[PDB]
Design a protein around this ligand. Structure first.
Ligand SMILES: C[n+]1cc2c3c(ccc2c2ccc4cc5c(cc4c21)OCO5)OCO3
Length: 218
């Protein structure tokens, strides 16, 4: 499916987005000059705390979009997890972790990937030590970390579902809904997907209030 935009305000410069100086320094150091189409439309509503549905393809700069929005909202001196990002695969979770860490390098933001597998015991030990500002992971592993009390939902105020169509195709619906039940019902939710079938749209109905809708056409 394809959504209908209800938001088409353009901010054509990162300098006009009221971002923190250290975050702006990270954006330019990453290689960005001018915001991409999705960045021009989605960063501002995301930072302002609205629920957002974004339909956008690969290669659009959509990863940096939600990473910038999360990093702008983090309270850096609160040593607790404040944002949770779900991805369908370990590779995308790791891609996101590295985007976030690069964009946040001048800020001292921390981001851990929760993916399990080869090095899972180092993953869980790092959590007992200090709670990272941002967690990104696949839904089964993240749900397990919440259920086992390694991750606290107490300070999680942002919840991002990236590649939502693929997450549902891979069988993660139950875990996504169980995660959402664990989080404060006052969490902002942002959902990004290249396609918007009925199953993805029901997540938005269930999790979001009157969301901003942004379509970046291919
Ligand atoms: C596909 N992409 C598009 C991007 C993009 C950007 C900025 C960065 C990325 C990016 C960064 C890391 C990546 C890492 C990846 C990847 C894809 C990307 C990737 O696939 C395998 O591992 O502005 C336009 O669109």
């Amino acid at each position: 499916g394809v959504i209908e935009s209800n938001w088409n305000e353009i901010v054509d410069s990162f300098d006009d987005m009221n971002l923190s100086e250290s975050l702006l320094r990270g954006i330019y150091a990453y290689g960005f000059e001018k915001p991409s189409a999705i960045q021009q439309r989605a960063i501002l509503p995301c930072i302002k705390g609205y629920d957002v549905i974004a339909q956008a393809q690969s290669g659009t700069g959509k990863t940096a979009t939600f990473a910038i929005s999360i990093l702008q909202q983090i309270e850096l001196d609160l040593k607790a997890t404040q944002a949770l990002v779900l991805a369908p695969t370990r590779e995308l979770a790791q891609q996101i972790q590295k985007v976030v860490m690069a964009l946040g390098d001048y800020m001292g933001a921390s981001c851990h990937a929760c993916i399990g597998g080869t090095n899972v015991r180092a993953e869980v030990q790092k959590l007992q030590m200090e709670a990272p500002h941002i967690i990104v992971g696949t839904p089964g592993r993240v749900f397990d970390m919440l259920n086992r009390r390694y991750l606290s939902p107490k300070y999680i105020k942002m919840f991002v579902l990236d590649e939502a169509d693929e997450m549902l195709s891979r069988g993660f619906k139950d875990q996504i809904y169980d995660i959402f039940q664990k989080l404060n019902s006052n969490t902002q939710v942002v959902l990004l997907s290249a396609t918007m079938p009925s199953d993805v749209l029901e997540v938005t109905k269930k999790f979001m209030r009157d969301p901003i809708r942004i379509l970046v056409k291919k």
